[PDB]
Design a protein around this motif. Structure first.
Motif, PDB file in Angstrom:
ATOM      1  N   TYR A 148       0.788  -1.152  -0.173  1.00 26.40           N
ATOM      2  CA  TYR A 148       0.040  -0.140  -0.038  1.00 26.40           C
ATOM      3  C   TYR A 148       0.906   1.320  -0.163  1.00 26.40           C
ATOM      4  O   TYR A 148       0.245   2.300   0.375  1.00 26.40           O
ATOM      5  CB  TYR A 148      -0.810  -0.085   1.167  1.00 26.40           C
ATOM      6  CG  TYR A 148      -1.832  -1.037   1.172  1.00 26.40           C
ATOM      7  CD1 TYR A 148      -2.953  -1.386   0.179  1.00 26.40           C
ATOM      8  CD2 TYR A 148      -1.891  -2.047   2.320  1.00 26.40           C
ATOM      9  CE1 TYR A 148      -3.584  -2.312   0.084  1.00 26.40           C
ATOM     10  CE2 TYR A 148      -2.645  -3.152   2.562  1.00 26.40           C
ATOM     11  CZ  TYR A 148      -3.638  -3.220   1.164  1.00 26.40           C
ATOM     12  OH  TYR A 148      -4.320  -4.539   1.286  1.00 26.40           O
ATOM     13  N   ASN A 149       2.181   1.269  -0.366  1.00 24.23           N
ATOM     14  CA  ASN A 149       3.013   2.320  -0.432  1.00 24.23           C
ATOM     15  C   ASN A 149       3.066   2.840  -1.798  1.00 24.23           C
ATOM     16  O   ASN A 149       3.653   4.011  -2.133  1.00 24.23           O
ATOM     17  CB  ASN A 149       4.378   1.923   0.297  1.00 24.23           C
ATOM     18  CG  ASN A 149       5.094   0.811  -0.524  1.00 24.23           C
ATOM     19  OD1 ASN A 149       5.006   0.740  -1.841  1.00 24.23           O
ATOM     20  ND2 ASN A 149       5.882   0.030   0.176  1.00 24.23           N
ATOM     21  N   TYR A 150       2.306   2.183  -2.942  1.00 29.07           N
ATOM     22  CA  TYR A 150       2.452   2.660  -4.260  1.00 29.07           C
ATOM     23  C   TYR A 150       1.119   2.576  -4.603  1.00 29.07           C
ATOM     24  O   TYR A 150       0.334   1.526  -4.519  1.00 29.07           O
ATOM     25  CB  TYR A 150       3.098   1.808  -5.188  1.00 29.07           C
ATOM     26  CG  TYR A 150       4.746   1.703  -4.814  1.00 29.07           C
ATOM     27  CD1 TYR A 150       5.417   2.930  -4.402  1.00 29.07           C
ATOM     28  CD2 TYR A 150       5.363   0.423  -5.035  1.00 29.07           C
ATOM     29  CE1 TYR A 150       6.746   2.867  -4.245  1.00 29.07           C
ATOM     30  CE2 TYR A 150       6.770   0.402  -4.398  1.00 29.07           C
ATOM     31  CZ  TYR A 150       7.471   1.516  -4.259  1.00 29.07           C
ATOM     32  OH  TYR A 150       8.713   1.439  -3.755  1.00 29.07           O
ATOM     33  N   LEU A 151       0.441   3.694  -4.908  1.00 32.36           N
ATOM     34  CA  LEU A 151      -1.067   3.712  -5.491  1.00 32.36           C
ATOM     35  C   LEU A 151      -1.101   4.642  -6.808  1.00 32.36           C
ATOM     36  O   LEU A 151      -0.072   4.855  -7.169  1.00 32.36           O
ATOM     37  CB  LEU A 151      -1.682   4.484  -4.374  1.00 32.36           C
ATOM     38  CG  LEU A 151      -2.175   3.680  -3.220  1.00 32.36           C
ATOM     39  CD1 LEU A 151      -1.154   3.665  -2.352  1.00 32.36           C
ATOM     40  CD2 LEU A 151      -3.558   4.543  -2.498  1.00 32.36           C
ATOM     41  N   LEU A 167      -7.585   7.551  -5.368  1.00 31.79           N
ATOM     42  CA  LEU A 167      -6.768   6.635  -5.451  1.00 31.79           C
ATOM     43  C   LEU A 167      -6.730   5.344  -5.101  1.00 31.79           C
ATOM     44  O   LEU A 167      -7.619   4.886  -4.275  1.00 31.79           O
ATOM     45  CB  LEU A 167      -5.571   7.392  -4.426  1.00 31.79           C
ATOM     46  CG  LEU A 167      -5.012   8.480  -5.011  1.00 31.79           C
ATOM     47  CD1 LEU A 167      -3.949   9.129  -3.837  1.00 31.79           C
ATOM     48  CD2 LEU A 167      -4.162   8.381  -6.196  1.00 31.79           C
ATOM     49  N   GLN A 168      -6.115   4.280  -5.692  1.00 36.95           N
ATOM     50  CA  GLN A 168      -6.289   2.989  -5.412  1.00 36.95           C
ATOM     51  C   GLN A 168      -5.005   2.259  -5.556  1.00 36.95           C
ATOM     52  O   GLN A 168      -4.021   2.719  -6.201  1.00 36.95           O
ATOM     53  CB  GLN A 168      -7.160   2.132  -6.553  1.00 36.95           C
ATOM     54  CG  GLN A 168      -7.901   0.823  -6.239  1.00 36.95           C
ATOM     55  CD  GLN A 168      -7.062  -0.189  -6.277  1.00 36.95           C
ATOM     56  OE1 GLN A 168      -6.293  -0.617  -7.156  1.00 36.95           O
ATOM     57  NE2 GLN A 168      -6.880  -0.841  -4.983  1.00 36.95           N
ATOM     58  N   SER A 169      -4.766   0.963  -4.763  1.00 33.61           N
ATOM     59  CA  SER A 169      -3.341   0.510  -4.379  1.00 33.61           C
ATOM     60  C   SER A 169      -3.380  -0.722  -5.459  1.00 33.61           C
ATOM     61  O   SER A 169      -4.556  -1.442  -5.519  1.00 33.61           O
ATOM     62  CB  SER A 169      -3.363   0.102  -3.064  1.00 33.61           C
ATOM     63  OG  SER A 169      -2.262  -0.749  -2.898  1.00 33.61           O
ATOM     64  N   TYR A 170      -2.304  -0.876  -6.007  1.00 39.06           N
ATOM     65  CA  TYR A 170      -1.723  -2.142  -6.778  1.00 39.06           C
ATOM     66  C   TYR A 170      -2.112  -3.126  -6.466  1.00 39.06           C
ATOM     67  O   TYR A 170      -2.621  -4.540  -6.665  1.00 39.06           O
ATOM     68  CB  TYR A 170      -0.521  -1.914  -7.594  1.00 39.06           C
ATOM     69  CG  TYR A 170      -0.581  -0.823  -8.895  1.00 39.06           C
ATOM     70  CD1 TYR A 170      -1.267  -1.178 -10.055  1.00 39.06           C
ATOM     71  CD2 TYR A 170      -0.060   0.414  -8.549  1.00 39.06           C
ATOM     72  CE1 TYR A 170      -1.405  -0.383 -10.914  1.00 39.06           C
ATOM     73  CE2 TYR A 170      -0.168   1.461  -9.658  1.00 39.06           C
ATOM     74  CZ  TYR A 170      -0.595   0.972 -10.950  1.00 39.06           C
ATOM     75  OH  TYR A 170      -0.525   1.930 -12.116  1.00 39.06           O
ATOM     76  N   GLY A 171      -1.568  -3.365  -4.931  1.00 39.87           N
ATOM     77  CA  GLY A 171      -1.454  -4.539  -4.138  1.00 39.87           C
ATOM     78  C   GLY A 171      -0.629  -5.613  -4.730  1.00 39.87           C
ATOM     79  O   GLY A 171      -1.080  -6.735  -4.934  1.00 39.87           O
ATOM     80  N   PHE A 172       0.867  -5.250  -5.376  1.00 43.95           N
ATOM     81  CA  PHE A 172       1.726  -6.336  -5.808  1.00 43.95           C
ATOM     82  C   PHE A 172       1.968  -7.306  -4.858  1.00 43.95           C
ATOM     83  O   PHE A 172       2.041  -7.281  -3.703  1.00 43.95           O
ATOM     84  CB  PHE A 172       2.931  -5.206  -5.952  1.00 43.95           C
ATOM     85  CG  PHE A 172       2.930  -4.225  -7.036  1.00 43.95           C
ATOM     86  CD1 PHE A 172       2.390  -4.529  -8.305  1.00 43.95           C
ATOM     87  CD2 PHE A 172       3.062  -2.994  -6.753  1.00 43.95           C
ATOM     88  CE1 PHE A 172       2.237  -3.394  -9.322  1.00 43.95           C
ATOM     89  CE2 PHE A 172       2.967  -2.063  -7.777  1.00 43.95           C
ATOM     90  CZ  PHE A 172       2.605  -2.340  -9.209  1.00 43.95           C
TER      91      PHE A 172
END
Ligand code: 3Q9
Ligand code: NAG
Ligand code: NAG
Ligand code: NAG
Ligand code: NAG
Ligand code: NAG
Ligand code: NAG
Ligand code: NAG
Ligand code: NAG
Lengths: 192, 222, 660
Positions: C436-439, C479-484
């Motif tokens: 959740y640190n990249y959105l 904003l939405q999170s990629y959830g890698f």
């Protein structure tokens, strides 16, 4: 880039040293500066460039010094042709060069008592449909004064034969809308 | 060596105008040019720059991308286009040439830049108000003062004299100041001994060239 | 060992014409049936080359010459030998030609070819000597008197042994031996060609390109050279060591290389079969202009004229500081795509070569500038924008493209000059449990202008009732999170994406290179590239006194006239080294060799400022001509010179000009 001047206003008599200061908000090179003069209703003329040299055809009395962000223009003796507005300019730290604020270098003399006159609106002025009140003050130095539902003042340029200032206050009023003077030299308020 | 400005006049807010600057007495293809303005009762302000050939034209950020500068070397003429004209630009414009003193140093080339010659300049007035004739009004009165008030006129320059030019001592003509309506007005006063008022006549003459009006107004005593 | 020979007689120096000899292969490129233009150190055609001869003239006090003087080396030497009895035996090259400096010796001593680079005390009159023994009629090598000592020898090659014929022969010279010698970057380059001949003097006219022979890595300074010759002694030469000798007939010729532009013809086997020296005469100028050995009739002005340039100068602001590109690309943490992190790069010397050569970058794609051309282009600002996105979205970072990322997260202009790097970051920027640190911003009501960051928390209205800024129904956070996750597919894997924007303004150069500056010279016709602006001409100190922070001035024709070099900040002026656009008028080479020269917009009084100057000039309002002769006859136009002037090859047979 912008510069600031000191003092905001200057009043000295002829035949004494004059000093003006120009200060910078960002470091500039001391060989990238200039000083100009401007008398009212006349094109400005070059005085100094480079803070150390002189322009062609100007007497020696003009001089300059300073560095870093503090710069100084110096005049040894003052004659009637030095009585005008002065500007400091940087023109090498480019683009968007900026000028100074503006210093009035005028004459100071003995304190004088203003002549105070009052003028109510004319009858035919009311016939036209307008109204005005004229509070006139003449021949007084120094020029700062407070004159007393709106005000519109006008300070003329000084006469170079007595070094005084003439001031007029116009109070605008409509067809149907039915003077306080204070001065440094005055020690008692005068009312019309 | 001198330069001349032309194109000043009266323009409505939102129109365009072309100011022209000419030079005589020096080679016009060896120096750049600067346009610098002065607001009424304010300091000088940078406007525009053009190089010798037309390959470097910057602008002040306050008018960035608004004014356009151009020149014709063959006719020795300089043109300035004003586009997107605002009501703040009522001022005086000067066109001047750039110059510098050269100095050699250790593997360097130091230039002391400045501006040397300035033209008389041209005024530009920006107001939506239309032309109006001068409203001349008397001001009834050791020494005593009497004057004439000129109201609701445009443009700025107006001529006021007394006694058909035969009176030049004690005359005070104050600079015009714009009012809320947008019309320039002022008053001109003369101080004379009180005894002479009842024995000598006095007239105030107002000349307004743009409207071509000459007005001779007598001041009575109440 | 050293002997000063006597009995030489005085004779004035002699010269001959080099014709079209001395051409050599300038490189090793594999070619077949092509014409190739190259500027290199060549012998100009029809040069006056110096003629030296070893002979002994019959008669009382007959001329006796044994020519081995010191000669300069300059920028390389063409050397030609006409031999029958093998008198020329080699050379020595150096500056002092004594033990104070190193010298190169290439000498064939009748048994071996010897090449040695050593500190030699060469004799003032060095020579080899052959003795003829009357009783057995034998010519044997007897004397080797080149140097008196050799110390600190640094290079030695001795060829396989042989036994060379040393007999003094009768008749005409029978072998021509040609060499081209160059000293470039510490390497002594030798080219050679051998030809059978039958002559007494001069050089043959036949064309033959010299084939590169050897490249010696010796790294010594060479400014002078000396020829080593073999003399004869026998019962017919009574005297002492200095006077008891005679000279076998031999000749050699010296011509000098200089920077010249040649057009070389390579045949089907790659052999140079012909060449054009562009600056010999106007016909060669036309041939080099049209890139052809055959030129048809007509009028051509693009041929112009060239004295050619001498050297090249490269200049840039002297900055050595290393750029932080490595620090930026090797950072541990970055901002998100909606908050792309921008760094400004200024005051540096670049190193894009290692970045391009790196094999760890998945996508390295550039627009506006090629990677090879990027090293020689000079910038004023660098913008580094960094972020991280999933792999499939990487293809959306490109000019003139659409998509949610392009529309709503990062835009590029249609006139983008710059380049993009992106590379896989599965291990470093992904972990189990989600990230959740990249959105990324998915929902907003309009597109983005180019280079516009946005971190607004405006709540997107997805229904038909305003949110008023409060979370509700059909009310989406932008904003939405990629959830890698490290176990997902390659399309879902994170990728580090950076874009480098090369902002070019009209301002002093800031970050450029990497290329070393070169000393500046003036009053010479040179090539130059100031801050990325390339030109050919002569640089002079002239003043136009233009503005601060200006770099170049242009004329009406939009060509650069003024330049300001960085390391000096001086106002240099550019002057073309030609006489202007000059027109050639030809009736065709296969028909005639006479040509006409028209100096357009040039008076006949300026022409003298190969036809040296005016000898019989006709002046028209179109210009001056030297070849055409006026006649009072009027004929139909054949080649229209212009301004009512037409020319043709007509009657004698010459080019004539006429007016209908
Ligand atoms: C300058 C000294 C020199 C001498 C001495 C010679 C002699 C020489 N040189 C050669 C051959 C030779 N000599 C060389 C190189 C060479 N011999 C030398 O003594 C020197 C010096 C060189 C060149 C650096 C080559 C590449 C060849 C073969 C060329 C060919 O056949 O196309 C011969 C026997 C062939 C013939 O008669 O044409 C002979 C007699 N040639 C030279 O250049
Ligand atoms: C040859 O002559 C030079 C100059 O005249 C001289 O320096 C040298 O010693 C002489 N050598 C011999 C061996 O005579
Ligand atoms: C070569 O030099 C000689 C000596 O001055 C000169 O007379 C001759 O004209 C020159 N030839 C060429 C082709 O330059
Ligand atoms: C020629 O030189 C080589 C190398 O120095 C040497 O071995 C050989 O003996 C020499 N030939 C003669 C005839 O001296
Ligand atoms: C010829 O005679 C000389 C002197 O005796 C000798 O040095 C040489 O080797 C002889 N030549 C042959 C080919 O035998
Ligand atoms: C080589 O030259 C150097 C010059 O400084 C000298 O000191 C040295 O002794 C030389 N080598 C020999 C073997 O003499
Ligand atoms: C070129 O090569 C061919 C064979 O490849 C050969 O027969 C021919 O003689 C060579 N030269 C020319 C001029 O064809
Ligand atoms: C980044 O780190 C690698 C690994 O240590 C290093 O070799 C490289 O020089 C650094 N910089 C760049 C631009 O790759
Ligand atoms: C290169 O930079 C150094 C660093 O100040 C300076 O001393 C030198 O003069 C520069 N070289 C130039 C300006 O040619």
């Amino acid at each position: 880039i912008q510069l600031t001047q000191s003092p905001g206003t200057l009043s000295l008599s002829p035949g004494e040293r004059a000093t003006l200061s120009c200060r910078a908000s960002q470091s500039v090179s001391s060989s990238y500066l200039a000083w100009y003069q401007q008398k009212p209703g006349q094109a400005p003329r070059l005085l100094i460039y480079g803070t150390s040299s002189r322009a062609t055809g100007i007497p020696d009395r003009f001089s300059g010094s300073g560095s870093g962000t503090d710069f100084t223009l110096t005049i040894s003796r003052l004659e009637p042709e030095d009585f005008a507005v002065y500007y400091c300019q940087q023109y090498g730290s480019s683009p968007q060069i900026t000028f100074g604020q503006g210093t009035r270098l005028e004459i100071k003399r003995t304190v004088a008592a203003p002549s105070v006159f009052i003028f109510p609106p004319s009858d035919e002025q009311l016939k036209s449909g307008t109204a005005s009140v004229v509070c006139l003050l003449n021949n007084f130095y120094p020029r700062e004064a407070k004159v007393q539902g709106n005000s519109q003042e006008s300070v003329t340029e000084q006469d170079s034969k007595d070094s005084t200032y003439s001031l007029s206050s116009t109070l605008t009023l409509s067809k149907a809308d039915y003077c306080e003077v204070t001065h440094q030299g005055l020690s008692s308020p005068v009312t019309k | 060596v001198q330069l001349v400005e032309s194109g000043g006049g009266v323009v409505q807010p939102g129109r365009s105008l072309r100011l022209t600057c000419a030079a005589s007495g020096f080679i016009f293809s060896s120096y750049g040019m600067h346009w610098v303005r002065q607001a009424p009762g304010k300091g000088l302000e940078w406007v525009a720059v053009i190089s010798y050939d037309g390959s470097y034209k910057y602008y002040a950020d306050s008018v960035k991308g608004r004014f356009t500068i151009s020149r014709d070397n063959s006719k020795n003429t300089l043109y300035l286009q004003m586009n997107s004209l605002r009501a703040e630009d009522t001022a005086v414009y000067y066109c001047t040439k750039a110059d510098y003193y050269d100095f050699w140093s250790g593997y360097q080339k130091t230039y002391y830049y400045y501006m040397d010659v300035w033209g008389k300049g041209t005024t530009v007035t920006i107001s939506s108000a239309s032309t109006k004739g001068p409203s001349v009004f008397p001001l009834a009165p050791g020494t005593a003062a009497l004057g004439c008030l000129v109201k609701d006129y445009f443009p700025e320059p107006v001529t006021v004299s007394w006694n058909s030019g035969a009176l030049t001592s004690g005359v005070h003509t104050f600079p015009a100041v714009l009012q809320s309506s947008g019309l320039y007005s002022l008053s001109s006063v003369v101080t004379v001994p009180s005894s002479s008022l009842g024995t000598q006549t006095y007239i105030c003459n107002v000349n307004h060239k743009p409207s071509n009006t000459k007005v001779d107004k007598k001041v009575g005593r109440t | 060992q050293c002997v000063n020979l006597t009995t030489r007689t005085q004779l004035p120096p002699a010269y001959t014409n080099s014709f079209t000899r001395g051409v050599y292969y300038p490189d090793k490129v594999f070619r077949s049936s092509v014409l190739h233009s190259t500027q290199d150190l060549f012998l100009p055609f029809f040069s006056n080359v110096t003629w030296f001869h070893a002979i002994h003239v019959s008669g009382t006090n007959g001329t006796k010459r044994f020519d081995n003087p010191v000669l300069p080396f300059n920028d390389g030497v063409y050397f030609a030998s006409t031999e029958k009895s093998n008198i020329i035996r080699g050379w020595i090259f150096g500056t002092t030609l004594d033990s104070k400096t190193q010298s190169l010796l290439i000498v064939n001593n009748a048994t071996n070819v010897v090449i040695k680079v050593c500190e030699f005390q060469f004799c003032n009159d060095p020579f080899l000597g052959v003795y003829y023994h009357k009783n057995n009629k034998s010519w044997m090598e007897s004397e080797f008197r080149v140097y008196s000592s050799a110390n600190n020898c640094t290079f030695e090659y001795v060829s396989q042994p042989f036994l060379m014929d040393l007999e003094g022969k009768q008749g005409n010279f029978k072998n021509l031996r040609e060499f081209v010698f160059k000293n470039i970057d510490g390497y002594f380059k030798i080219y050679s060609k051998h030809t059978p001949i039958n002559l007494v003097r001069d050089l043959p006219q036949g064309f033959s390109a010299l084939e590169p022979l050897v490249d010696l890595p010796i790294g010594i300074n060479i400014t002078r050279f000396q020829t080593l010759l073999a003399l004869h002694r026998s019962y017919l030469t009574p005297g002492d060591s200095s006077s008891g000798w005679t000279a076998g007939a031999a000749a050699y010729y010296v011509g000098y290389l200089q920077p010249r532009t040649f057009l070389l013809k390579y045949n089907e086997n790659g052999t140079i079969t012909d060449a054009v020296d562009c600056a010999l005469d106007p016909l060669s100028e036309t041939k080099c202009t049209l890139k052809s050995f055959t030129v048809e009739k007509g009028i051509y002005q693009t041929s112009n004229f060239r004295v050619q340039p001498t050297e090249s100068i490269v200049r840039f602001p002297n900055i050595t500081n290393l750029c932080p590109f490595g620090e930026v690309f090797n950072a541990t943490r970055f901002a998100s795509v909606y908050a792309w992190n921008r760094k400004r790069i200024s005051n540096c010397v670049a190193d894009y070569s290692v970045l391009y050569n790196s094999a760890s970058f998945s996508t390295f794609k550039c627009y506006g500038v090629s990677p090879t051309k990027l090293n020689d282009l000079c910038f004023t600002n660098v913008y580094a924008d960094s972020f991280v996105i999933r792999g499939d979205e990487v293809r959306q970072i490109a000019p003139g493209q659409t998509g949610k990322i392009a529309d709503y997260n990062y835009k590029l202009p249609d006139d983008f000059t710059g380049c993009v790097i992106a590379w896989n970051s599965n291990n470093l920027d992904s972990k189990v449990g989600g990230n959740y640190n990249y959105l990324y911003r998915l929902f907003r009501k309009s597109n983005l202008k180019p280079f516009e960051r946005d971190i607004s928390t405006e709540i997107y209205q997805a229904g038909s009732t305003p949110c008023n800024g409060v979370e509700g129904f059909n009310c989406y956070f932008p904003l939405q999170s990629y959830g890698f996750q490290p176990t997902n597919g390659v399309g879902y894997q994170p990728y580090r994406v950076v874009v480098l924007s090369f902002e070019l303004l009209h301002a002093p150069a800031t970050v450029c290179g990497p290329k070393k500056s070169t000393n500046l010279v003036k009053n010479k016709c040179v090539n130059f590239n100031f801050n990325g602006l390339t030109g050919t001409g002569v640089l002079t100190e002239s003043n136009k006194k233009f503005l601060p922070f200006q770099q170049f001035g242009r004329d009406i024709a939009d060509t650069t006239d003024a330049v300001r070099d960085p390391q000096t900040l001086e106002i240099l002026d550019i002057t073309p080294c030609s006489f202007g656009g000059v027109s050639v008028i030809t009736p065709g080479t296969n028909t005639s060799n006479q040509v006409a020269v028209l100096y357009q917009d040039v008076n006949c009084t300026e022409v003298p400022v190969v036809y040296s100057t005016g000898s019989n000039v006709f002046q028209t309002r179109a210009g001056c001509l030297i070849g055409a002769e006026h006649v009072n006859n009027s004929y139909e136009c054949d080649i229209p010179i212009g301004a009512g002037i037409c020319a043709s090859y007509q009657t004698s047979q010459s080019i004539i000009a006429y007016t209908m």
